[PDB]
Symmetry: C3
Subunit: 120 residues, 3 copies
């Protein structure tokens, strides 16, 4: 078929693939610095502002927390309702997706040269 | 061991990982703008031309359709036999792989800032 | 919680996601040219030197071998103990992760424009 079901506008280029949660919500970062949560019907569930572009896909944790790195150097942990659970500061931009260990530890590399292991 | 089984030429740099189909076919996009379907013995099954470089890996749907974004701005849906199923225009280059939802909807972000949801 | 469990210093930016192996070891490539194997407690298990930045995530085979491409043009197969199993030369930088077929063949694209199939 190949027809448009909908389009959803962000402010700048979307450089990484979206991620779909179990409840169908689609998550996508934008170069406009926001993480968007989009309902299956194309309406905005919420958006979360980081300070600079989001270059890599978000990752969804076992408990539903959404993790995303920003060019503002922080790794963000976002609750399913769109409020910030926490943010973790690294020295430079985070250009790749975090990885979650089986025991819940969040691993993320930074342009500051370190691999960080973070408690969930 | 580590010896070469074969090598397959494309015109320019290959910037994303190949993807392997159920039948063993290896799919890979090239900066020469073509999507290549390569047999396990390294001969070309087919190639599909897009207008500009392909920067992200293709994605294979459950029915075997091969989806690939192009810097020419279109998302291409290609049948296993190399014929075009459809192509979907966005405003600018598609730099990341599409993602397929459970109901089959295809999601793809574009450098034009939109997330597109496309009916398969 | 959101506090640092530990951090691990490499010489330059880490551009790709880390990869957790089947024994829990964390593997990550650095722009300083090394692949690092990091224990869960944050101590270095070993590091493996390539000639130039590693831009993509390593891939781990079912037998424990770790594969990683380098901007020095080589694909490296590394044993779990950090010794080189073999090294495979391509003409130019390898910018994306390899992929392993069901028969064990290693597939990898290169900036020299070829898709290589390598015997394991």
């Amino acid at each position: 078929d190949g027809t448009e079901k909908w389009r959803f506008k962000t402010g700048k280029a979307i450089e990484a693939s979206p991620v779909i949660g179990e409840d169908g919500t689609i998550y996508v970062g934008s170069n406009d610095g926001h993480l968007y949560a989009i309902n299956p019907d194309g309406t905005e569930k919420w958006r979360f502002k980081t300070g600079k572009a989001i270059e890599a896909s978000p990752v969804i944790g076992e408990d539903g927390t959404i993790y995303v790195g920003s060019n503002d150097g922080h790794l963000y942990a976002i609750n399913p309702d769109g409020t910030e659970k926490w943010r973790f500061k690294t020295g430079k931009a985070i250009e790749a997706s975090p990885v979650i260990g089986e025991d819940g530890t969040i691993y993320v590399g930074s342009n500051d040269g370190h691999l960080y292991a973070i408690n969930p």
